[PDB]
Design a protein around this ligand. Structure first.
Ligand SMILES: Nc1ncnc2c1ncn2[C@@H]1O[C@H](COP(=O)(O)OP(=O)(O)O)[C@@H](O)[C@H]1O
Ligand SMILES: [Mg+2]
Lengths: 146, 145, 219, 148
């Protein structure tokens, strides 16, 4: 009803009513997608704000200095990557033939995400969280910004 | 991107009930602390020269009472007369820059006391204007007191 | 303009100006400002809202004219200053804007989007042609929140998808329209609820709300 | 100073004799600056207590007339400028367009400075703008108060 039929050149202000970050008692795949899109929002947000500050200081000929903060782009990559990302591995596990369980998917994540800094599981091969008694089996941790 | 955080204070849907722990969970969830850092950089605060000289023209005895243009020249002798160290602030073409926020606390404190001095400067002229009115009425009534 | 944020300040209105920065002093700041009933606090140019679960007179149309085309930092913190900075960045500088609103379910996001829509429809001054779009979105919100939102463990109702709204203008300021765009429907809640949670509301409204001839009609 | 000739001393004697209701050639502390503000010199209350405490080592506030002439000689040309007063009203403007909201001004004038009383600030709102209400203009008001 309210969309213009004409193809004329226009301007736009949009609003995005979307969730915040979530930690439940029991987190599953839907919370993995929810937290993923949160990681994307934080990534593009802090990146564009950083460019905004560098523009404001490059106008006034003021030297920018680097300041340390959490990088979301390592996290997003961990889920996004087409060759070892967690959605690519679960897409593969839904595609690859054979016995496909949840245990074999968690073992695949223990195989192809061990040498990643921000992946955290007990049965990972490079694990410094093996003797971490607070990590139950049939679970894993992701080091989000929260 | 312009951006809105939303914080839930309680689970009881009440008005006056505040819980520190639930809000602390939502500070961690939303990442308010990491939102501070990108605006919290090498200069933590900045202004433009015109509302800065409008803001602090009463702390500088050269700008007092009016005004004084150009704005960068009056802001410059403002920070010169207040003898804040040159490390603490920085000049631009169209912006003044404040590195640490404690200078912004201090300058607003000193301005806040000069507001009281302006109130004294008003009230003595108002009350002395009432006494000038009374002496003006009684002066035109008699040849001698 | 000589007026600033630092007048009429309870606590500090900006987290950027907060000395020592941790969680704890920030909880002190939000508890002070919320107990003194000032529910907006910035981070740079970022709005922080806390839900008071009640009406405050900061949304009167008299209060709108206090805020209109005053700059961002010049006055006390409120949600309208961000929409005024965006509306001046769009109107005067021709830069298309978007406001991302994130937070907990029940923390006041949807209402804030409604208030930004009402504020822009007020300050554009285009009458029934913008109030048809505003009436469309505001009267379409309980529909979308009935279909796509459901009860979780933590909340009685929760945003299980992202609502989006395009607010489309002419160069002259005439409203050319707007587009709702959904994102990320949690699909597996349709077919498998988790324990203690709930499937999407329209099934429970459909079963509990219908007459017996409608339930016998829908089999 | 040098100090004052007979003409200005006899000019001061008229307000000094106006507030001499008993006819004794001296007055007390709380009515002492009312003569100086009646004649247009206008010191503050705080520096008035400085002038009283300057010559009194006893602490009762008994002031003689030649020291009173010295107080008036220090504040003869110490009267403050009109534009300085005008800017001092320009600071308390709400929008930068030449007015003050009346309730905020009533809150300032009864909490900062030498604390004008209840009838004096209610008088001040009506002297500033008799038409009302809740908003006072001060462009004519300062021109009326600064003229001697
Ligand atoms: N800014 C606000 N002012 C007044 N009430 C609010 C505000 N934000 C939220 N509320 C209250 O919260 C309830 C709905 O909030 P909502 O926006 O749906 O939260 P969420 O978007 O997190 O689900 C309403 O009943 C409303 O009274
Ligand atoms: Mg909502």
């Amino acid at each position: 009803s309210i969309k213009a039929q004409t193809k004329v050149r226009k301007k736009v202000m949009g609003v995005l009513d979307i969730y915040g970050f979530e930690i439940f008692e029991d987190n599953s795949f839907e919370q993995f997608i929810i937290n993923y899109c949160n990681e994307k929002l934080q990534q593009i947000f802090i990146e564009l704000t950083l460019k905004e500050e560098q523009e404001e200081y490059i106008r006034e000929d003021i030297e920018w200095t680097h300041i340390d903060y959490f990088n979301n782009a390592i996290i997003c990559d961990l889920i996004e990557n087409n060759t070892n990302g967690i959605l690519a591995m679960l897409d593969e596990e839904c595609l690859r033939p054979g016995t496909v369980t949840d245990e074999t998917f968690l073992e695949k994540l223990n195989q192809v995400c061990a040498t990643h800094q921000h992946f955290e599981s007990r049965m990972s091969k490079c694990s410094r969280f093996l003797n971490d008694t607070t990590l139950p089996h049939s679970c894993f941790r992701i080091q989000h910004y929260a | 991107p312009n951006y809105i955080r939303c914080i839930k204070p309680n689970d009881k849907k009440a008005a006056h009930i505040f819980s520190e722990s639930l809000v602390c969970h939502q500070i961690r969830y939303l990442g308010l602390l990491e939102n501070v850092r990108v605006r919290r950089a090498g200069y933590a605060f900045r202004q433009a020269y015109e509302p800065c000289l409008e803001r602090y023209k009463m702390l500088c005895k050269q700008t007092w009472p009016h005004w004084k243009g150009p704005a960068r020249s009056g802001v410059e002798v403002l920070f010169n007369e207040l003898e804040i160290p040159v490390e603490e602030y920085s000049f631009g073409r169209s912006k003044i820059f404040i590195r640490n926020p404690r200078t912004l606390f201090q300058l607003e404190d000193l301005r806040k006391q000069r507001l009281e001095d302006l109130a004294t400067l008003i009230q003595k002229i108002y009350r002395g204007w009432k006494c000038r009115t009374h002496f003006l009425l009684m002066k035109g009534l008699n040849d001698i007191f | 303009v000589k007026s600033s944020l630092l007048d009429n300040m309870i606590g500090v209105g900006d987290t950027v100006l907060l000395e020592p920065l941790n969680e704890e002093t920030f909880i002190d700041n939000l508890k002070k400002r919320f107990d003194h009933n000032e529910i907006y606090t910035y981070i740079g140019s970022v709005v922080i809202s806390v839900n008071p679960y009640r009406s405050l007179p900061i949304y009167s149309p008299e209060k709108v004219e206090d805020y209109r085309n005053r700059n961002f930092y010049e006055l006390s913190p409120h949600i309208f200053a961000l929409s005024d900075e965006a509306y001046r960045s769009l109107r005067d500088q021709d830069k298309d804007q978007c406001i991302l609103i994130t937070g907990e379910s029940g923390a006041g996001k949807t209402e804030a989007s409604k208030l930004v829509m009402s504020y822009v429809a007020a300050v554009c001054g285009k009458g029934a042609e913008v109030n048809q779009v505003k009436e469309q979105l505001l009267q379409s919100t309980p529909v979308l929140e009935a279909f796509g939102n459901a009860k979780t463990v933590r909340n009685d109702n929760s945003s299980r998808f992202g609502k989006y709204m395009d607010i489309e203008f002419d160069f002259k300021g005439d409203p050319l329209g707007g587009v709702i765009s959904n994102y990320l429907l949690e699909k597996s809640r349709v077919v498998k609820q988790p324990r203690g949670e709930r499937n999407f509301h329209v099934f429970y409204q459909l079963l509990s709300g219908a007459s017996e001839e409608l339930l016998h009609k829908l089999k | 100073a040098d100090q004052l000739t007979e003409e200005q001393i006899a000019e001061f004697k008229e307000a000094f004799s106006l507030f001499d209701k008993d006819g004794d050639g001296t007055i007390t502390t709380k009515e002492l600056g009312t003569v100086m503000r009646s004649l247009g010199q206008n010191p503050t209350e705080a520096e008035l207590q400085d002038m009283i405490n300057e010559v009194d080592a006893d602490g009762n506030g008994t002031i003689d007339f030649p020291e009173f002439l010295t107080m008036m000689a220090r504040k003869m040309k110490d009267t403050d400028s009109e534009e300085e007063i005008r800017e001092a009203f320009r600071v308390f403007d709400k929008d930068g367009n030449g007015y003050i909201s009346a309730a905020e001004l009533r809150h300032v004038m009864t909490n900062l400075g030498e604390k004008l009383t209840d009838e004096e600030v209610d008088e001040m709102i009506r002297e500033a703008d008799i038409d009302g209400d809740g908003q006072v203009n001060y462009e004519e008001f300062v021109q009326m108060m600064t003229a001697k």
